[PDB]
Each structure stands twice: as structure tokens, then as C-alpha cells.
């Protein structure tokens, strides 16, 4: 919910920065929510799903962006318990990311994004949402813990993939038939003022389109914060329209459409993943920013790192759950 008057009122996105708490990625980037979801899926279904790849949207968007946005370094667990590749971040690497996480400008940017998200949403549908909680959005905290998400059974080649996704907010309500169409993703960046600004804008839209298109989210409401953390203008996008806008830009008309190449590369990556590991074989998928030529798919050994990674990624709750499933 955001009328034009609110963005005409020059809302500040920096108020209450000190209140911005945030959780840690180590226990956040865990398959446990998806693991529970699949737990009930096989609880009432009674048979294991044909889905093979299970992960979070972050890994997928990173590897889609790789052919042209390759400025990323990561390590990916490739555990293959029960013939279902549970790709997720390497848990020791998560602890190292805390040091790699390190400043103040970046944290201010994340706070600006979350404040913009909180300002342009509503905890309840507009009719039943009383006026007091309409005019209380700016006086609340910015909790980076509680989120709403859903699991999507997308498909590439001949493999079914389950992807979780932190849904920002639905458009006007929750459609019980096709919930994906009603979903919206909220993002904000610095306002455009010159050609370099719109080039960085185009790259940001490339990665955002990759994200949404993997989740199949049509709408994009995209904020434009100014230098001093204040929203100035907002505008919307459609997922399918992004490539056409990018490759038909009258300003700076000048290669080819990276979307098809990224999709084909991601399909090749999926084929590589489903052809490389046979069963119950833990690996470590990684990429160095200096590589720029190849993907590092190494397998871990010594029966200690493998076991600790299996225990960390998959709690015994899921492991014991499959026991009766085979029964």
C-alpha cells in the first residue's frame, strides 16, 4: 500500500537507524524451513517427491548472474542425502563470512531498504487495517528476522527444483489459486542522474529480474532513494518486460541479450550437478573472483567434515523422517 501522496511527502528512510537489529546468516541460510515443509509434503503424500535440487534463491540468483555479474565468491555444500541434492552454504564458510561481512555505509543502505519496505506495506489488508496502525509505520522497529516465504517447484531441462523465497508482500491480498501473480518484491537504489547511474541501474535490474524470474514474481516496485537516505520517486516493473526494456533502450542504444545465455548456462549447471554426484557424496562447489573461467566442484573426504556438514545442513529430524518413509 503506497499512495502517490506519500512519495510526494518526501519520506525519510534514515530515521531510527540505531534500532535496526539483524540476525546472523549462519543459522539463517539453513534448509530447516524447507526441510520441515518437505517433511509435511511426504507426511501426507506418503512418497518422496521427484524434486532433486533444493536450495535458496540466493545461490540460484548468484549463479544465474555469473556469466556477466561474476563479482561473487562463495562455497556451496553439495550434500546428496537420499538422492536429493541439498545445496546450501558451507557452514564453516558462513562463520568466515562474518569477518568478510565487516562498515557503516553498507549497513545504512540495508536499513534504507528495510525502512522503505516497512513504509510501503501493511500488516493487514487495507479495509480492516485501522487508521492508528496506518499512521504508525514510521515508529516501528526494523526486524531482519521474521519473514514470509514459500517453496516454488520450478523446472529446468528434466529436473524439478524446490526454491524458497522471502516474499516481500502481496499486492492487494492473497490469491488462493495463483499466489505468484499477486506477489511483489521491494527494492530501492540511488536515483538516476547520468549514464553511469543508469548502467548500474540496468545491472541491478538484471540481477533483480534473475531473482524474480527464478521465483516467477511478475511485479517489481523499485524505490529511488537520494544521497541522504530519503525516498524521492518510485515506479513499477513487470518481470517479462525487463529484457525488452533493457535491449530496447533509446538512450545509449549500444552486444546481445544476456538473459538467454544466463538461462542456458544455468541449465548446463543443473545438468552438471545432476550428472556429477551419484549418491550420498558431499562436495564443495566454489568460485573465486579471479577464476573467471571455470567452476570448482571438489568433494570433501576424511569422514569427519562430511559427517559434520551432513549434521549441520540436515538435522537428524529429517534424516529419521526418511527412515519411516522407506518403510
Amino acid at each position: 500500500y503506497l499512495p502517490d501522496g506519500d512519495i510526494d511527502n518526501s519520506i525519510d528512510l534514515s530515521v531510527g537507524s540505531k534500532h535496526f537489529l539483524l540476525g546472523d546468516s549462519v543459522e539463517l541460510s539453513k534448509l530447516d524451513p524447507i526441510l520441515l515443509a518437505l517433511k509435511e509434503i511426504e507426511k501426507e503424500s506418503g512418497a518422496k517427491t521427484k524434486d532433486r535440487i533444493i536450495t535458496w534463491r540466493g545461490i540460484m540468483r548468484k549463479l544465474l548472474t555469473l556469466p556477466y555479474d561474476s563479482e561473487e565468491d562463495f562455497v556451496l555444500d553439495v550434500v546428496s542425502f537420499d538422492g536429493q541434492l541439498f545445496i546450501q552454504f558451507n557452514v564453516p564458510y558462513l562463520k568466515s563470512k562474518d569477518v568478510q561481512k565487516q562498515t557503516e555505509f553498507h549497513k545504512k543502505l540495508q536499513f534504507s531498504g528495510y525502512k522503505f519496505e516497512k513504509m510501503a506495506t501493511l500488516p493487514k489488508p487495507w479495509p480492516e487495517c485501522t487508521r492508528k496502525e496506518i499512521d504508525s509505520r514510521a515508529k516501528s522497529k526494523c526486524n531482519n528476522i521474521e519473514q514470509y516465504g514459500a517453496i516454488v517447484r520450478t523446472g529446468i531441462s528434466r529436473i524439478k527444483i524446490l526454491i524458497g523465497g522471502a516474499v516481500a508482500c502481496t499486492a492487494d491480498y492473497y490469491d488462493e489459486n495463483d499466489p505468484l501473480s499477486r506477489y511483489i518484491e521491494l527494492k530501492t537504489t540511488r536515483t538516476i542522474n547520468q549514464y553511469k547511474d543508469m548502467i548500474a541501474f540496468e545491472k541491478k535490474l538484471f540481477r533483480t529480474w534473475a531473482q524474480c524470474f527464478l521465483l516467477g514474481i511478475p511485479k517489481i516496485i523499485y524505490g529511488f532513494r537520494d544521497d541522504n537516505c530519503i525516498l524521492r520517486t518510485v515506479e513499477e516493473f513487470s518481470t517479462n518486460d525487463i529484457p525488452l526494456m533493457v535491449k530496447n533502450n533509446p538512450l545509449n542504444e549500444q552486444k546481445e541479450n544476456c538473459y538467454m545465455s544466463s538461462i542456458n548456462f544455468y541449465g548446463a549447471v543443473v545438468e552438471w550437478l545432476n550428472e556429477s554426484v551419484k549418491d550420498d557424496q558431499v562436495w564443495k562447489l566454489s568460485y573465486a573472483k579471479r577464476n573467471r573461467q571455470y567452476l570448482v566442484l571438489k568433494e570433501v573426504t576424511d569422514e569427519n567434515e562430511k559427517q559434520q556438514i551432513v549434521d549441520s545442513a540436515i538435522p537428524a529430524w529429517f534424516k529419521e523422517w526418511r527412515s519411516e518413509l522407506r518403510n
Binding site: 501522496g5 499486492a171 538516476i192 542522474n193 547511474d197 529511488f224 524521492r232 515506479e235 538512450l251
Partner: protein, 687 residues
């Protein structure tokens, strides 16, 4: 009245209706099919006001002379067909007829009804125009007559396939344009509502302009006649009243700079609407220092503009007042009271000098000092200051109730069907002090029966309309309520110009005495009158070829369902649908008009194609007031000329553009600053 002020101050609002018929499409001037594109701009909904048509007395300049009911029914049907043809709705038809009025209203037309009886007696030394009222046998014949017309139009015109007609006859409790307001608010509380659902209303009262702003639907307008050259066989020209353009005006005016709180135009309009309800309305007498003819609306706006920077907020919010906020406005106005009294007195004396060049006892002398004391004992006939001080303070308390009761009545429905202002006069702005200490409350109550209103609204000269049993308690001197029925009443002239605008002082009807006598006469009433003496719920009529026609039959005729929460649909109607009694869609709906072949033929139709279902609104909710989500604004009409000529014009009283009507474009927001698209909109075409 104030319509002239709206026309003068806001010129671009009015626009003539393009009444084009027999369009020469492809070289043939064939009659315009209902499915043809509208040159007035496309429309979604159409809320009629049958009380805007059914008044033979409202147009006495010509000689219509409706003598037989069949003639007037045929004329009404033809006029409704004409207005719908020139409007061309596409989703919903709402038909509103005045029902049982709230307790605070019939007193205002008791003066009007008694005046119609008073001057009639003096005129003794023509159809019964007082028969248009709930509970009469005429409305019962009118209610069923239009239901045939609704069934006829759906099953004959191919263009009426998707239309849904909603009927709210006079049996439905509530006032006419109050029904329209409540209906839109129910569609407002549905989360699946479409924010771009253009509406429009046919109406005559000037309150419809303010109510159109109250609903806060930008894509809105009003259908109105010429009322310019109609004073003087040929079609009467009509005028559109584009409230969407008017929203552009008030946005510019009500944008006062330098506020400690953020500007909110839609919140300002609520204050602006509230401003126009001291200057004039039909529930409370106007303040003695206020006159719309004296452009008092511009006055209150000015004091409103100066006061806001000091204030921390708005006078009202979602129809609820801020007593400290209004107190400052009223107190500030009290200073101007002395000046205008003398100014009004001097100008009329100056005016009287111009004709001199060409050619209860009043005596208050408002232009002379000390009038405040002299005003009260003159009216209430008591010289004791203690009596005056007690009456003056108490009478202010009731006045604040009304301006609070009326605001809810236009925003949250009727808050009370028992309150009524117990005085014939308004207090000065000076007396509006210590308001915050006062307390306000209401009780919803129950509506009066249609017969109960008749004895509370008919005079002694119209005993025929009311059932003949009640004539004993109405006209005979032995009646215990005969004191409520005087042949002559003291018309307090109040120093006006002509007697017709005086105040018909009448005793206020006691509630207990009014109804207790009626309960002794309910037993001997006829069943036909008894059925006519019961309020019901409105009616929805649905065509066969409509998209949701099978769905209702599937549940209300096959599954034996009782209540089906219909929610939104193709036509946009929402609520609960129930089936009429044991009614079957197998009989024939006869035509009760007994057509005389004077106007068309009107063939009769069985009950096979169409289907009617008992309708009901969505559950009542505390309706807020702000623009919706995803709403697309229309094209801007004002281009920097009337923007300036109204900011600094001060006093400016010296081809339709349908392209500006309806939503324009698809973006929810306007491209400004850095927005890529805005950058492309300016930089890309620059180089």
C-alpha cells in the same frame, strides 16, 4: 442556490453533454445502439435518484399536467430510458427511492409540507403532489412498476447483458442519497475492489457535490440538467459535473504552505466538506451571521486557511470531530460577527437608496451593539439573564450534536434515528466556547414505520394519502395528538425579504404520544396495508446472459442454499444474496400500468429469462477515508492558467473534453526526477 457560486468560482467543472443521436455511421444515420461507444466517455456505474424525477410540482413553468398515474409512469419510464441512453453505464444500475427518513429530517420538511398546505388554503379564494412519500398506495404501484421495467430492459436490449440492476424502493429504510453513500462504502471494504471504477449520479440536490467528495473516489461525476436557460418537445440539454476536475482545484487552494504536519489533500477535502455544512444544510438552521448568498463559504475558507499553521492537525478525521480544533475556528469567526452585521445592514440601505433613485417582533438591530442580549429575550420572551444564560449554553450543546451527527451521517451512515435539533434558531459564533468540556453520544434506534412517518409529515389537508382509519386521530378534534395538527401556525418572518423564506414555528412532535395512539390502530389495519406497513431489504435483478447468472441458480435454485456471500464479480457488485420467498422463475411478470398505446407498446414478459434475488450489503465497517491502492489518475485538465488565476485571481466573476475523463495511462505514479522512465522521458528524447 450555491450551484451558481460553484459555476462562477470554478468554471471548468461544468461541461455540456453531447446529446448526439442518429449518428451517421458509415453513411447511415441509424439509431444509436446501446453497444456503440459513448462520446461522453466510458462509464461503469450509474446511481439513479428517482426522487430527482418524480415531482410534477418541481417543474410548474410548463404544463405537463400528470392527471392519470399511467401517464406519469410512462413519462418516468421514457425519461429514465433517455437518461440511461445518454449515460450508457456498463456494470451496475442502482435505483434509489427515498425511504423512511431519519428522525432529524422530517421536521425540516414538516415546515415544507405545512407550508404547502398553508398557501394552498389561501390560494382557494392539479395532481396531488404530496402523494410522493413512503407508505402511500402510489409508491406501492411505483415500486412494482419499475421492477417490470428492469426486467423488460435486460431481456430485450442486447447491450444490457452484463448490467446488474439493484432496486432499493421506498420500503427500504434510509434516505435516498444516503443509500447511495452506504452502498459505495460497502464496495470500499471489499479487498478485491477495483480502484478505477468510474461512477456518476443523476440528482438535483446540491449536497450531491459534497457527497461525491466524501466517497473519495477520484473517477466520479454527476449528471445534471442545464438549469441555465430552462426558465425560458425538444430535448433538454444536460450538463456534466466532473468532480475529478474539482479535485484538482481544491488541491491547489487547500495547499497552505508552512505546516508543522504533512499536507494531505484528501484529508483537507474532509475539512473543506465540513466547512460547507455550517454555511448551509437541511438538518440545522444556519448561523445568524452566515449566508451562502453572501458568499459565506469563502469566508469560512479564509479563516480556515489562517488558522491551520497554528494548529497541529485537521478539524475532523473520518467523520469524527476535534472539538478543540473547531473551537478555534468558531472563536476566530466571532470577531467578524460585528463587522458583517453592520456591513449587511449598510449595504441593503445603500441598495435601497438605489431604488429610491430609481423610484417575534424582531427589532433586534443586529447592526447595533448589545444585540447579543437583545437577540435572545426577543425570541424566547424572557428577560431574566439566568434564563437566557442557561438556554443559550444548552442550545449550543444541541447544535454541536447536530454538526457531529450530520458528519457521521455522510461518512459512517446514520449514527442515530432519534436525535433532532430542538430549537428553531442557531446561536452566534461567540457562544461557541468551552466546547471541549462538552460530551456527545448517540443511540442508533429503530426506523419509524412508513405510516408513522406519514402522520409526522402529512398536514391536515392530505388525510386521503394516509389510511382512512388514522383520519380520526389526525383531523378530528377529539384526537389526543390534534395539538400537533394546527390549521394556522405563526410564521416567524424573522426580518427576511419575502414570506416564503420565513420560519414555520410548529410544536415538536413528542415521540411517546405520536406512536402510542398508533399501536391502538395496528390491529384493524388491512393485510394489504400491513404488508405496505413493513420495511424490507433491497432487491437485485440479474439477466439471463450475465456471467454470474448460472452461479446463483446453481446455489439458490439447485443446491437449496440460503445465504451466498457473493463478493466481487464481473459487474463489481458485492454482498449477500438470498432468494425471494417461494418465488419461482416460471410465472409471468404482468405490467401494472395498463398501457394505453400512447407511448410505445411495452410487451409483457414471463419470468423465465431474468432472475431476481434478495440482496444485502456487506457487513458494516468503520470506513476510513483515503485514496485506494493502484489507482490511476486521469489526464490533467488545468494547464498553469486556472492554476494561477485562482491563486491570485481573488474575485473572477465576470466542446467537451471526454479525453480527460476516466483513468489515463497505466502507471500508478507520475514520472518525476530519477526514475529511469522519467530519465528516458527527458534525456533520451533530448539526445
Amino acid at each position: 442556490a450555491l450551484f451558481r457560486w460553484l459555476s462562477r468560482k470554478y468554471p471548468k467543472i461544468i461541461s455540456p453533454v453531447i446529446q448526439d443521436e442518429d449518428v451517421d455511421i458509415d453513411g447511415e444515420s441509424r439509431p444509436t445502439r446501446y453497444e456503440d461507444p459513448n462520446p461522453n466517455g466510458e462509464l461503469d456505474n450509474l446511481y439513479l435518484d428517482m426522487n430527482g424525477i418524480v415531482h410534477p410540482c418541481s417543474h410548474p413553468e410548463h404544463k405537463p399536467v400528470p392527471e392519470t398515474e399511467d401517464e406519469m409512469m410512462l413519462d418516468v419510464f421514457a425519461y429514465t430510458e433517455n437518461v440511461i441512453m445518454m449515460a450508457r453505464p456498463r456494470k451496475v444500475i442502482y435505483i434509489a427511492v427515498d425511504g423512511v427518513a431519519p428522525r432529524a429530517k422530517m421536521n425540516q420538511q414538516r415546515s415544507r409540507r405545512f407550508r404547502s398546505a398553508q398557501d394552498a388554503k389561501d390560494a382557494n379564494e392539479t395532481w396531488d403532489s404530496n402523494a410522493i412519500t413512503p407508505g402511500t398506495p402510489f409508491m406501492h404501484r411505483l415500486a412494482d412498476s419499475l421492477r417490470y421495467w428492469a426486467a423488460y430492459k435486460l431481456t430485450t436490449d442486447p447491450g444490457w447483458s452484463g448490467i446488474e440492476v439493484i432496486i432499493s424502493d421506498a420500503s427500504v429504510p434510509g434516505e435516498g442519497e444516503h443509500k447511495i453513500m452506504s452502498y459505495v462504502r460497502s464496495l470500499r471494504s471489499s479487498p478485491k475492489h477495483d480502484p478505477n471504477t468510474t461512477h456518476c449520479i443523476y440528482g438535483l440536490a446540491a449536497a450531491l457535490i459534497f457527497l461525491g467528495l466524501a466517497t473519495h473516489e477520484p473517477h466520479f461525476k454527476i449528471l445534471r440538467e442545464d438549469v441555465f436557460a430552462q426558465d425560458k418537445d425538444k430535448k433538454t440539454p444536460f450538463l456534466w459535473l466532473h468532480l475529478n476536475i474539482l479535485r484538482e482545484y481544491l488541491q491547489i487552494e487547500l495547499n497552505v504552505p508552512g505546516l508543522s504536519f504533512p499536507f494531505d489533500l484528501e484529508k483537507s477535502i474532509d475539512d473543506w466538506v465540513f466547512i460547507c455544512f455550517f454555511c448551509g444544510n437541511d438538518f440545522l438552521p444556519h448561523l445568524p451571521s452566515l449566508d451562502v448568498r453572501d458568499n459565506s463559504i469563502t469566508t469560512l475558507v479564509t479563516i480556515w486557511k489562517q488558522i491551520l499553521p497554528t494548529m497541529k492537525g485537521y478539524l475532523t478525521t473520518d467523520g469524527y470531530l476535534n472539538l478543540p480544533a473547531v473551537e478555534r475556528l468558531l472563536a476566530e469567526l466571532a470577531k467578524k460577527e460585528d463587522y458583517i452585521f453592520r456591513k449587511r445592514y449598510e449595504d441593503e440601505k445603500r441598495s435601497l437608496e438605489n431604488q429610491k433613485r430609481r423610484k417575534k417582533n424582531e427589532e433586534i438591530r443586529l447592526w447595533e451593539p448589545g444585540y447579543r442580549k437583545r437577540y435572545y429575550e426577543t425570541k424566547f420572551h424572557t428577560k431574566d439573564p439566568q434564563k437566557v444564560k442557561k438556554i443559550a449554553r444548552n442550545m449550543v450543546q444541541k447544535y454541536i450534536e447536530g454538526v457531529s451527527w450530520v458528519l457521521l451521517y455522510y461518512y459512517q451512515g446514520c449514527p442515530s434515528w432519534n436525535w433532532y435539533y430542538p430549537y428553531h434558531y442557531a446561536p452566534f459564533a461567540a457562544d461557541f466556547v468551552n466546547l471541549s468540556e462538552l460530551k456527545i453520544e448517540f443511540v442508533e434506534g429503530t426506523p419509524f414505520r412508513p405510516y408513522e412517518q406519514l402522520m409526522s409529515v402529512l398536514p391536515a389537508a392530505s388525510s386521503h394519502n394516509l389510511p382512512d382509519v388514522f383520519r380520526s386521530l389526525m383531523s378530528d378534534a377529539n384526537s389526543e395528538i390534534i395539538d400537533f395538527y394546527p390549521e394556522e401556525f405563526p410564521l416567524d418572518m424573522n426580518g427576511k425579504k419575502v414570506i416564503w423564506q420565513a420560519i414555520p414555528l410548529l410544536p415538536f412532535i413528542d415521540e411517546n404520544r405520536l406512536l402510542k395512539a398508533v399501536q391502538s390502530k395496528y390491529d384493524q389495519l388491512t393485510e394489504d396495508e400491513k404488508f405496505r406497513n413493513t420495511n424490507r431489504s433491497e432487491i437485485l435483478v440479474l439477466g439471463r446472459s450475465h456471467s454470474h447468472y448460472p452461479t446463483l441458480v446453481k446455489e439458490l435454485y439447485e443446491e437449496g442454499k440460503d445465504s451466498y456471500e457473493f463478493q466481487v464479480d464481473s459487474s463489481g457488485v458485492s454482498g449477500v444474496a438470498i432468494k425471494l420467498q417461494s418465488f419461482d422463475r416460471s410465472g409471468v411478470l404482468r405490467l401494472p400500468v395498463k398501457q394505453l398505446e400512447g407511448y410505445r407498446h411495452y410487451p409483457d414478459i414471463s419470468n423465465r429469462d431474468f432472475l431476481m434475488v434478495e440482496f444485502k450489503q456487506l457487513p458494516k465497517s468503520h470506513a476510513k477515508s483515503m485514496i485506494l491502492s493502484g489507482l490511476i489518475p486521469h489526464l490533467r485538465r488545468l494547464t498553469q492558467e486556472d492554476k494561477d488565476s485562482i491563486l491570485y485571481g481573488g474575485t473572477n466573476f465576470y466542446a467537451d473534453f471526454k479525453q480527460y475523463i476516466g483513468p489515463h495511462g497505466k502507471s500508478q505514479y507520475l514520472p518525476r526526477q530519477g526514475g529511469y522512465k522519467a530519465f528516458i522521458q527527458i534525456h533520451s528524447d533530448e539526445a
